[PDB]
Coordinates of C-alpha atoms (C1' of nucleotides) in Angstrom, one line a residue:
Chain A
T1 CA 2.1 28.0 30.4
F2 CA 0.2 28.8 27.1
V3 CA 1.3 30.4 23.8
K4 CA -0.4 33.7 24.8
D5 CA 1.7 34.0 27.9
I6 CA 5.0 34.1 26.0
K7 CA 6.8 37.4 26.3
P8 CA 10.2 38.7 25.0
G9 CA 12.9 37.8 27.5
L10 CA 11.1 35.0 29.3
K11 CA 13.0 31.8 29.8
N12 CA 12.4 28.3 31.3
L13 CA 9.2 28.2 29.1
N14 CA 7.5 24.8 29.3
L15 CA 4.5 24.2 27.1
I16 CA 2.8 22.0 24.6
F17 CA 1.8 22.9 21.0
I18 CA 0.8 21.3 17.7
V19 CA 2.7 22.3 14.6
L20 CA 0.7 23.8 11.8
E21 CA 3.5 24.5 9.2
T22 CA 7.2 23.9 8.7
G23 CA 9.1 26.6 6.8
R24 CA 12.0 26.5 4.4
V25 CA 15.5 25.8 5.6
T26 CA 18.1 28.6 5.7
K27 CA 21.8 28.3 6.6
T28 CA 23.7 30.4 9.1
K29 CA 27.1 31.7 8.1
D30 CA 28.7 29.1 10.3
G31 CA 26.9 26.1 8.8
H32 CA 23.7 25.5 10.8
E33 CA 20.4 24.8 9.2
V34 CA 17.5 26.9 10.6
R35 CA 13.8 26.6 10.0
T36 CA 10.8 28.4 11.3
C37 CA 7.7 26.4 12.4
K38 CA 4.3 27.9 13.0
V39 CA 2.9 26.3 16.2
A40 CA -0.3 26.8 18.1
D41 CA -2.4 26.4 21.3
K42 CA -6.1 27.0 22.0
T43 CA -4.8 30.5 22.9
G44 CA -3.2 31.3 19.5
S45 CA -0.1 30.8 17.4
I46 CA 3.6 31.6 17.4
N47 CA 6.7 30.9 15.4
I48 CA 9.5 28.7 16.8
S49 CA 12.9 28.6 15.1
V50 CA 14.6 25.3 15.2
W51 CA 18.3 24.7 14.5
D52 CA 19.9 21.6 13.2
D53 CA 18.7 18.0 12.7
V54 CA 15.7 17.9 14.9
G55 CA 14.4 20.6 12.6
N56 CA 14.2 18.0 9.8
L57 CA 12.3 15.5 12.0
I58 CA 9.4 17.9 12.9
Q59 CA 6.2 17.5 10.8
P60 CA 3.0 19.5 10.5
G61 CA 0.4 17.8 12.8
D62 CA 3.1 16.9 15.4
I63 CA 2.1 17.6 19.0
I64 CA 5.3 18.8 20.7
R65 CA 6.3 19.5 24.3
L66 CA 9.0 22.2 24.7
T67 CA 11.0 22.4 28.0
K68 CA 13.3 25.3 29.0
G69 CA 12.2 27.4 26.0
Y70 CA 12.9 31.1 25.8
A71 CA 11.5 33.9 23.7
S72 CA 13.0 36.8 21.9
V73 CA 12.2 39.2 19.1
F74 CA 13.9 38.5 15.7
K75 CA 13.2 40.9 12.8
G76 CA 10.3 42.5 14.6
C77 CA 8.9 39.1 15.3
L78 CA 8.3 37.6 18.8
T79 CA 9.8 34.1 18.4
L80 CA 10.1 31.0 20.5
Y81 CA 13.3 29.0 20.9
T82 CA 14.8 25.9 22.7
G83 CA 17.0 26.9 25.5
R84 CA 20.3 25.5 26.8
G85 CA 19.4 22.4 28.8
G86 CA 16.0 22.3 27.1
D87 CA 14.4 20.2 24.3
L88 CA 11.6 19.5 22.0
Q89 CA 9.8 16.2 22.3
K90 CA 7.0 14.8 20.2
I91 CA 4.3 13.4 22.4
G92 CA 1.6 12.8 19.9
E93 CA 0.0 14.0 16.6
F94 CA -3.1 15.4 15.0
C95 CA -5.4 15.2 18.0
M96 CA -5.2 18.7 19.5
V97 CA -7.5 21.7 19.1
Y98 CA -5.8 25.0 18.5
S99 CA -6.5 28.6 17.4
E100 CA -4.5 30.3 14.7
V101 CA -5.3 33.7 16.1
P102 CA -3.8 35.8 17.5
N103 CA -0.5 35.2 15.7
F104 CA 1.9 36.4 18.4
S105 CA 4.8 36.4 15.8
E106 CA 3.3 39.1 13.6
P107 CA 5.5 42.2 13.3
Chain B
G1 CA 14.8 1.4 22.8
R2 CA 14.4 -2.3 22.2
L3 CA 10.7 -2.5 21.1
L4 CA 10.0 0.7 19.2
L5 CA 11.5 2.8 16.4
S6 CA 12.2 6.3 17.8
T7 CA 13.8 9.4 16.4
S8 CA 15.7 11.8 18.7
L9 CA 12.6 14.0 18.6
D10 CA 10.3 11.2 20.0
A11 CA 9.4 11.3 23.7
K12 CA 10.3 8.1 25.6
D13 CA 7.5 5.6 25.4
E14 CA 6.1 4.7 28.8
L15 CA 5.0 1.2 27.7
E16 CA 8.4 0.4 26.2
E17 CA 10.1 1.7 29.3
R18 CA 8.0 -0.6 31.5
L19 CA 8.5 -3.7 29.4
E20 CA 12.3 -3.1 29.3
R21 CA 12.3 -2.8 33.1
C22 CA 10.5 -6.2 33.3
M23 CA 12.8 -7.9 30.8
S24 CA 15.8 -6.7 32.9
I25 CA 14.2 -8.2 36.1
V26 CA 13.8 -11.6 34.3
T27 CA 17.4 -11.2 32.9
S28 CA 18.8 -10.6 36.4
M29 CA 17.6 -14.1 37.3
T30 CA 18.2 -16.0 34.0
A31 CA 21.7 -14.8 32.8
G32 CA 24.8 -16.7 33.7
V33 CA 22.8 -19.6 35.1
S34 CA 21.5 -23.0 33.7
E35 CA 17.9 -23.3 32.3
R36 CA 16.7 -25.4 35.2
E37 CA 18.3 -23.0 37.7
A38 CA 16.6 -20.1 35.8
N39 CA 13.1 -21.6 36.0
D40 CA 13.6 -22.4 39.7
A41 CA 14.5 -18.7 40.2
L42 CA 11.5 -17.4 38.2
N43 CA 9.1 -19.8 39.9
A44 CA 10.3 -18.6 43.4
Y45 CA 10.1 -14.9 42.4
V46 CA 6.6 -15.2 40.9
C47 CA 5.3 -16.8 44.2
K48 CA 6.1 -13.6 46.1
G49 CA 3.0 -12.0 44.7
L50 CA 0.8 -10.8 41.8
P51 CA 2.9 -7.8 40.8
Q52 CA 6.0 -10.0 40.6
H53 CA 3.9 -12.4 38.4
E54 CA 3.2 -9.6 36.1
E55 CA 6.8 -8.5 35.9
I56 CA 8.0 -12.0 35.0
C57 CA 5.3 -12.6 32.4
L58 CA 5.8 -9.2 30.8
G59 CA 9.6 -9.8 31.0
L60 CA 9.5 -13.2 29.2
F61 CA 7.1 -11.6 26.7
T62 CA 9.5 -8.8 25.9
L63 CA 12.4 -11.3 25.6
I64 CA 10.3 -13.1 23.0
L65 CA 9.9 -9.9 21.1
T66 CA 13.5 -8.8 21.4
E67 CA 15.6 -12.0 21.5
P68 CA 14.6 -14.4 18.7
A69 CA 17.4 -16.8 19.7
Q70 CA 15.9 -17.1 23.2
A71 CA 12.3 -16.8 22.1
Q72 CA 11.3 -20.6 21.9
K73 CA 12.9 -21.1 25.4
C74 CA 11.1 -18.0 26.8
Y75 CA 7.7 -18.9 25.5
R76 CA 8.2 -22.3 27.1
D77 CA 9.1 -20.6 30.4
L78 CA 6.1 -18.2 29.9
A79 CA 3.6 -21.0 29.5
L80 CA 5.1 -22.8 32.5
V81 CA 5.2 -19.9 34.9
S82 CA 2.0 -18.1 33.8
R83 CA -0.9 -18.4 36.3
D84 CA -3.6 -16.5 34.4
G85 CA -3.5 -18.5 31.1
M86 CA -1.3 -15.8 29.6
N87 CA -4.1 -13.2 29.9
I88 CA -1.8 -10.3 31.0
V89 CA 0.3 -11.1 28.0
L90 CA -2.7 -11.0 25.7
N91 CA -3.8 -7.6 27.0
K92 CA -0.3 -6.3 26.4
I93 CA -0.3 -7.7 22.9
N94 CA -3.6 -6.0 22.1
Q95 CA -2.3 -2.8 23.6
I96 CA 0.9 -3.0 21.5
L97 CA -1.2 -3.7 18.3
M98 CA -3.7 -0.9 19.0
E99 CA -1.2 1.8 20.1
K100 CA 2.3 1.0 19.0
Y101 CA 2.2 -1.1 15.9
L102 CA 3.5 1.6 13.5
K103 CA 6.5 2.2 15.7
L104 CA 7.2 -1.5 16.3
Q105 CA 10.7 -2.6 15.2
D106 CA 11.0 -5.1 12.4
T107 CA 12.4 -7.8 14.6
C108 CA 9.6 -7.2 17.2
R109 CA 7.0 -7.4 14.4
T110 CA 8.4 -10.7 13.1
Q111 CA 8.6 -12.0 16.7
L112 CA 5.0 -10.9 17.5
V113 CA 3.7 -12.8 14.5
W114 CA 5.7 -15.9 15.7
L115 CA 4.2 -15.4 19.2
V116 CA 0.6 -15.2 18.1
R117 CA 0.9 -18.3 16.0
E118 CA 2.4 -20.1 19.0
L119 CA -0.6 -18.8 21.1
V120 CA -3.1 -20.2 18.6
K121 CA -1.4 -23.6 18.5
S122 CA -1.5 -23.7 22.4
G123 CA -5.2 -23.0 22.3
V124 CA -4.8 -19.9 24.5
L125 CA -8.1 -18.2 25.5
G126 CA -8.6 -15.0 23.6
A127 CA -6.3 -15.8 20.8
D128 CA -9.0 -15.3 18.3
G129 CA -9.4 -11.8 19.7
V130 CA -5.7 -11.2 19.2
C131 CA -5.9 -12.4 15.6
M132 CA -8.7 -9.9 14.8
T133 CA -6.8 -7.1 16.4
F134 CA -3.8 -8.2 14.3
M135 CA -5.9 -8.1 11.1
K136 CA -7.0 -4.6 11.9
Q137 CA -3.3 -3.4 11.5
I138 CA -3.3 -4.6 7.8
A139 CA -4.2 -1.3 6.2
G140 CA -6.5 -1.1 3.1
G141 CA -5.1 0.7 0.1
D142 CA -1.5 0.0 1.1
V143 CA 0.8 -2.2 -0.9
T144 CA 4.1 -1.3 0.8
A145 CA 6.4 -4.3 1.5
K146 CA 5.7 -4.2 5.3
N147 CA 1.9 -4.1 4.9
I148 CA 1.9 -7.0 2.4
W149 CA 4.2 -8.9 4.7
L150 CA 1.6 -8.6 7.5
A151 CA -1.3 -9.6 5.2
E152 CA 0.5 -12.8 4.2
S153 CA 1.8 -13.5 7.6
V154 CA -1.6 -13.4 9.3
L155 CA -3.2 -15.3 6.4
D156 CA -0.6 -18.1 6.8
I157 CA -1.5 -18.5 10.5
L158 CA -5.2 -18.6 9.7
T159 CA -4.9 -21.2 6.9
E160 CA -2.4 -23.5 8.7
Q161 CA -4.7 -23.4 11.8
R162 CA -8.0 -23.4 9.9
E163 CA -9.5 -26.1 12.3
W164 CA -9.0 -23.7 15.2
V165 CA -10.4 -20.8 13.2
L166 CA -13.6 -22.7 12.7
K167 CA -14.2 -22.6 16.5
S168 CA -14.8 -18.8 16.3
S169 CA -17.8 -17.6 14.4
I170 CA -16.8 -14.0 14.8
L171 CA -13.2 -14.8 13.6
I172 CA -14.6 -16.5 10.5
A173 CA -16.8 -13.5 9.5
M174 CA -14.0 -11.1 10.3
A175 CA -11.3 -13.0 8.4
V176 CA -13.6 -13.2 5.4
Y177 CA -14.6 -9.5 5.6
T178 CA -10.9 -8.5 5.9
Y179 CA -9.5 -10.7 3.1
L180 CA -12.4 -10.1 0.7
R181 CA -11.5 -6.4 1.0
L182 CA -7.7 -6.7 0.7
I183 CA -8.0 -8.9 -2.4
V184 CA -9.0 -5.8 -4.4
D185 CA -5.6 -4.2 -3.6
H186 CA -3.5 -7.3 -4.5
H187 CA -2.5 -7.0 -8.2
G188 CA 0.2 -5.3 -10.2
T189 CA 3.2 -7.6 -9.3
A190 CA 3.8 -11.3 -9.4
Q191 CA 4.1 -11.1 -5.5
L192 CA 0.7 -9.5 -5.2
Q193 CA -1.0 -11.9 -7.5
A194 CA 0.4 -15.0 -5.7
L195 CA -0.8 -13.6 -2.4
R196 CA -4.2 -12.8 -3.9
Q197 CA -4.7 -16.4 -5.0
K198 CA -4.0 -17.6 -1.5
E199 CA -6.5 -15.1 -0.2
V200 CA -9.1 -16.2 -2.8
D201 CA -8.8 -19.9 -1.9
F202 CA -9.0 -19.1 1.8
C203 CA -12.1 -16.9 1.6
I204 CA -13.8 -19.3 -0.8
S205 CA -13.4 -22.3 1.6
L206 CA -14.9 -20.4 4.6
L207 CA -17.8 -19.0 2.5
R208 CA -18.7 -22.4 1.2
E209 CA -18.2 -24.3 4.5
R210 CA -19.5 -21.7 6.8
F211 CA -21.8 -19.4 4.8
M212 CA -24.3 -18.9 7.6
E213 CA -21.5 -17.6 9.8
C214 CA -20.4 -15.2 7.1
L215 CA -23.9 -13.8 6.8
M216 CA -23.6 -12.2 10.3
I217 CA -21.6 -9.6 8.3
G218 CA -24.8 -8.2 6.8
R219 CA -25.3 -6.4 3.5
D220 CA -21.8 -5.0 3.1
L221 CA -20.8 -8.6 2.4
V222 CA -22.5 -8.1 -1.0
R223 CA -20.6 -4.9 -1.7
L224 CA -17.3 -6.8 -1.1
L225 CA -18.4 -9.8 -3.2
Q226 CA -19.4 -7.6 -6.2
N227 CA -15.9 -6.0 -6.1
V228 CA -14.2 -9.4 -6.7
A229 CA -17.0 -10.9 -8.9
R230 CA -14.7 -11.2 -12.0
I231 CA -12.3 -13.5 -10.2
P232 CA -13.1 -17.1 -11.5
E233 CA -13.5 -18.6 -8.0
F234 CA -16.0 -15.9 -7.2
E235 CA -18.0 -16.2 -10.4
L236 CA -18.7 -19.8 -9.4
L237 CA -19.6 -18.6 -5.9
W238 CA -22.0 -16.0 -7.4
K239 CA -23.9 -18.4 -9.7
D240 CA -24.4 -20.5 -6.6
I241 CA -25.6 -17.5 -4.6
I242 CA -27.9 -16.5 -7.4
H243 CA -29.2 -19.8 -8.8
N244 CA -28.9 -22.4 -6.1
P245 CA -28.3 -20.7 -2.7
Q246 CA -29.3 -23.9 -0.9
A247 CA -25.9 -25.6 -1.7
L248 CA -24.4 -22.8 0.5
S249 CA -26.9 -23.4 3.2
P250 CA -30.6 -24.6 3.7
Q251 CA -31.1 -21.5 5.8
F252 CA -30.1 -19.2 3.0
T253 CA -33.1 -18.2 0.9
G254 CA -31.2 -15.8 -1.5
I255 CA -29.3 -12.5 -1.8
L256 CA -32.3 -10.4 -0.8
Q257 CA -32.4 -11.5 2.9
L258 CA -28.7 -10.7 3.0
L259 CA -29.3 -7.2 1.5
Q260 CA -32.1 -6.6 4.0
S261 CA -29.8 -7.2 6.9
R262 CA -27.8 -4.3 8.4
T263 CA -24.0 -4.5 8.6
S264 CA -22.6 -4.9 12.0
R265 CA -20.4 -2.0 13.1
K266 CA -17.4 -4.0 14.1
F267 CA -17.0 -5.1 10.5
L268 CA -17.0 -1.5 9.2
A269 CA -14.5 -0.5 11.9
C270 CA -12.1 -3.4 11.3
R271 CA -11.1 -1.9 7.9
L272 CA -9.8 1.2 9.5
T273 CA -6.4 1.1 11.3
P274 CA -6.4 2.4 14.9
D275 CA -4.7 5.6 13.7
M276 CA -7.3 6.1 10.9
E277 CA -10.1 5.8 13.5
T278 CA -8.5 8.0 16.1
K279 CA -8.1 10.8 13.5
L280 CA -11.6 10.6 11.9
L281 CA -13.3 10.3 15.4
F282 CA -11.3 13.4 16.4
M283 CA -12.4 15.3 13.3
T284 CA -16.1 14.4 13.9
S285 CA -16.1 15.4 17.5
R286 CA -13.5 18.0 18.3
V287 CA -12.8 20.0 15.1
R288 CA -14.9 23.1 14.7
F289 CA -16.6 23.5 11.3
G290 CA -14.5 26.0 9.3
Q291 CA -11.3 24.8 10.9
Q292 CA -11.0 21.4 9.2
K293 CA -8.5 22.2 6.4
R294 CA -5.1 21.3 8.1
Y295 CA -6.6 18.2 9.6
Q296 CA -7.9 17.1 6.2
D297 CA -4.5 17.9 4.6
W298 CA -2.7 15.9 7.3
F299 CA -5.0 12.9 6.9
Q300 CA -4.9 13.1 3.1
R301 CA -1.1 13.3 3.0
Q302 CA -0.8 10.2 5.1
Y303 CA -3.6 8.0 3.8
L304 CA -5.0 9.2 0.5
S305 CA -2.2 10.6 -1.7
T306 CA -1.1 7.4 -3.5
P307 CA -3.0 5.8 -6.4
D308 CA -3.0 2.5 -4.4
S309 CA -4.8 4.3 -1.6
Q310 CA -8.0 4.9 -3.6
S311 CA -9.8 1.7 -2.4
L312 CA -9.4 3.0 1.2
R313 CA -11.9 5.7 0.5
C314 CA -15.1 3.5 0.5
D315 CA -14.1 2.0 3.9
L316 CA -13.8 5.5 5.3
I317 CA -17.2 6.4 3.9
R318 CA -19.0 3.3 5.2
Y319 CA -17.3 4.0 8.5
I320 CA -18.6 7.6 8.6
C321 CA -22.1 6.5 7.8
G322 CA -22.4 3.4 9.9
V323 CA -20.0 3.7 12.8
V324 CA -19.9 7.4 13.6
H325 CA -23.3 8.3 15.1
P326 CA -22.7 11.5 17.0
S327 CA -24.7 12.5 20.1
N328 CA -27.4 15.2 20.0
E329 CA -25.0 17.7 21.6
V330 CA -22.4 17.3 18.8
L331 CA -25.1 17.4 16.1
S332 CA -26.3 20.7 17.7
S333 CA -22.8 22.2 17.9
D334 CA -20.4 23.9 15.5
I335 CA -18.4 20.6 15.2
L336 CA -17.4 19.4 11.7
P337 CA -20.5 17.5 10.5
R338 CA -20.4 14.1 8.9
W339 CA -21.7 15.4 5.6
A340 CA -18.7 17.8 5.3
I341 CA -16.3 14.9 5.9
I342 CA -18.1 13.0 3.2
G343 CA -18.0 15.9 0.8
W344 CA -14.3 16.2 1.4
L345 CA -13.7 12.5 0.7
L346 CA -15.7 12.6 -2.5
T347 CA -13.4 15.3 -4.0
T348 CA -10.3 13.3 -3.4
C349 CA -11.4 10.7 -6.0
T350 CA -9.0 10.6 -9.0
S351 CA -11.0 8.4 -11.4
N352 CA -14.5 7.7 -12.4
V353 CA -14.5 4.2 -11.1
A354 CA -13.3 5.3 -7.7
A355 CA -16.0 8.0 -7.8
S356 CA -18.7 5.4 -8.6
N357 CA -17.5 3.1 -5.8
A358 CA -17.4 6.0 -3.4
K359 CA -21.0 7.0 -4.3
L360 CA -22.2 3.4 -3.9
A361 CA -20.6 3.2 -0.5
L362 CA -22.3 6.5 0.5
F363 CA -25.8 5.4 -0.6
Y364 CA -25.4 1.8 0.4
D365 CA -27.9 1.8 3.2
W366 CA -30.4 3.7 1.1
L367 CA -30.9 0.8 -1.3
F368 CA -32.9 -1.5 1.0
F369 CA -33.6 0.9 3.8
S370 CA -36.4 -0.2 6.2
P371 CA -37.2 2.6 8.7
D372 CA -37.9 0.1 11.6
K373 CA -34.8 -2.0 11.1
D374 CA -32.2 0.5 9.8
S375 CA -30.8 3.6 11.5
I376 CA -31.6 6.9 9.8
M377 CA -28.1 8.0 10.8
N378 CA -26.7 5.8 8.0
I379 CA -28.6 7.6 5.2
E380 CA -28.4 11.1 6.6
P381 CA -24.9 12.0 5.3
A382 CA -25.8 11.5 1.6
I383 CA -28.9 13.7 1.7
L384 CA -27.2 16.3 3.8
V385 CA -24.2 16.5 1.5
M386 CA -26.6 16.9 -1.5
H387 CA -28.5 19.6 0.3
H388 CA -25.6 21.7 1.7
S389 CA -23.7 21.5 -1.7
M390 CA -26.5 23.2 -3.5
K391 CA -25.0 26.7 -3.6
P392 CA -21.3 26.2 -3.0
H393 CA -20.4 23.1 -5.1
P394 CA -23.5 22.4 -7.1
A395 CA -21.4 19.9 -9.1
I396 CA -21.5 17.4 -6.2
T397 CA -25.3 17.8 -5.7
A398 CA -26.0 17.1 -9.3
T399 CA -23.8 14.0 -9.7
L400 CA -25.1 12.4 -6.5
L401 CA -28.7 13.1 -7.6
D402 CA -27.8 11.4 -10.9
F403 CA -26.4 8.5 -9.1
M404 CA -29.4 8.1 -6.8
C405 CA -31.6 7.8 -9.8
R406 CA -29.3 5.6 -11.9
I407 CA -28.4 3.2 -9.1
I408 CA -32.0 2.0 -8.9
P409 CA -32.1 0.0 -12.1
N410 CA -28.3 -0.7 -12.2
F411 CA -27.2 -1.8 -8.7
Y412 CA -28.8 -5.2 -9.1
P413 CA -31.4 -5.2 -11.9
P414 CA -33.5 -8.2 -10.7
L415 CA -34.3 -6.2 -7.6
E416 CA -34.9 -2.8 -9.1
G417 CA -38.4 -2.7 -7.4
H418 CA -36.9 -3.3 -4.0
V419 CA -34.1 -0.8 -4.5
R420 CA -36.7 1.8 -5.7
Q421 CA -38.7 1.0 -2.6
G422 CA -35.5 1.5 -0.5
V423 CA -34.7 4.9 -1.9
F424 CA -38.3 6.0 -1.5
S425 CA -38.4 4.8 2.2
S426 CA -35.1 6.6 2.8
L427 CA -36.4 9.8 1.4
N428 CA -39.8 9.6 3.2
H429 CA -38.1 8.8 6.5
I430 CA -35.7 11.7 6.0
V431 CA -38.7 14.0 5.9
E432 CA -40.5 12.3 8.8
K433 CA -37.4 12.8 11.0
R434 CA -36.9 16.4 9.9
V435 CA -33.4 15.7 8.7
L436 CA -34.5 17.7 5.7
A437 CA -38.0 19.3 6.0
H438 CA -38.6 19.9 2.3
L439 CA -37.4 17.8 -0.7
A440 CA -38.8 20.0 -3.4
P441 CA -36.2 22.9 -3.3
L442 CA -33.6 20.3 -4.2
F443 CA -35.1 19.4 -7.5
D444 CA -36.0 22.8 -9.0
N445 CA -32.9 24.8 -7.8
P446 CA -32.0 27.2 -10.7
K447 CA -28.3 26.6 -10.1
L448 CA -28.7 23.0 -11.4
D449 CA -28.6 21.3 -14.8
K450 CA -30.9 21.6 -17.8
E451 CA -31.2 17.8 -18.2
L452 CA -31.0 16.9 -14.5
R453 CA -33.6 19.5 -13.2
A454 CA -35.9 17.7 -15.7
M455 CA -34.7 14.2 -14.7
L456 CA -35.5 15.2 -11.1
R457 CA -39.0 16.7 -11.7
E458 CA -39.9 13.2 -13.0
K459 CA -38.4 10.4 -11.0
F460 CA -40.4 11.3 -7.9
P461 CA -43.7 13.2 -8.5
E462 CA -44.1 13.8 -4.7
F463 CA -41.4 16.5 -4.8
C464 CA -42.7 19.5 -6.9
Chain C
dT1 C1' 29.4 16.5 22.1
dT2 C1' 23.5 18.6 23.5
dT3 C1' 24.2 23.5 19.5
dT4 C1' 20.3 27.2 22.2
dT5 C1' 18.1 34.7 25.6
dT6 C1' 21.7 31.4 18.1
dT7 C1' 20.3 33.5 12.6
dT8 C1' 26.1 37.9 7.4
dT9 C1' 22.9 41.9 3.0

DNA sequence: TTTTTTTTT
């Protein structure tokens, strides 16, 4: 699976991407930290929103494997997420080619 | 994990998982039993076959890294049960050093140093190789506590076992190259000064006793010696190099023959950590030109953002010129060219001295360039960065041009003639190989300087 | 307790 294949409502998404940017942390009303990370493939880029502590571990340049991801539209923006029973795992850094475009998370 | 530091984000390390499996195999036979009974059990098990032999050796190895109170016993058992002179262990050490060193737990690092020293004393085959791989993990431009610890730790092994070091010509040259370079970084605290003195004495003794072996380094040895010339021990060494070279060796005529000898690539490479190399090689082979910004930012953030890191920059530059010689296919593609990498690195300099050292490193193979002995790929980045910076950043073109002229009488004044000849040969050969067809439009470009455009239209008549 | 087709205006 590639970034370009991601569609609203799809689940059990398994793919690899490199992170380009980590956004600022916001807090949900029940106390969770959330941050948006821009990640990319050779087929383009998409935002992933990451809750809680793993969100602070992620760094730009990280090559990450997502398992059991799902996708949904938040504020007009197609967004990627870690599902129940899924996880994010860093498997390398820096050495991955990617395209910024298209940005599948643009409203 | 017992070997490596891991966050909850980190994937499980396959190598760590395999070593832990082996340790647990050894442990199943050694726990709850006497030491004689344990050795009988391991002996038996190893005899079953060659994969069992690997399991046991790797197991004992991992116990040495993870159980310091069992380490001496386990090395003894390792030496006893090993059938391949500990070769499988040496490969795994090199693998750990090249791939895992940054994630290696403090205990495991401490233990690995202990193990290598124990390997040297035992006269194990390939130990010198392991020491060189170890030295490569000591990062230039890094005075963090852990890095300094490694510098001193490896130095202590080398000095205590100097007789053994003398058996390895390559290890002599490599140790001298490594420590001559690190000495530049070691000042600012009492701790750093005390380590520098030990590094000075060590390098001096090898240079004087084994000069000829040190010469296999080639001309970059001079660059390193200039950078430490004001240290008293080295001033003495210089007057011997300049005035009576014969004391150093009957086969050493003088500094010129050393300047006319190319630097071997393994020396330029040993001053980049595995991670530095992997990143630069990736940038110069896979990154499309126009797409390099985030890669540069990521590299800069990790390696070039501290004041202490400034010295690392000449190593990167010598590495780009002398080690990275891209195929014809890469050169004819849209891949990030070497000159753009060089241009990027030059802009990260934060002082005039750093800038000057960076420029010298860039032009270093120009100085005594002979077209039949030297590679044109070593001198290509400088001319290409000058050329391609004409329009966009004419500041860079100007200053490098200025340096190219002024380095001729200044680099080493008693050899201005030779240096002049070198720069001329470089320029000529750059035309003959069509790296840059015409040298004239670089010296009259309207976007240049009042004084410089004049200084150019003089220093070489052949380019109007 | 592994959050998770999550996110106050």
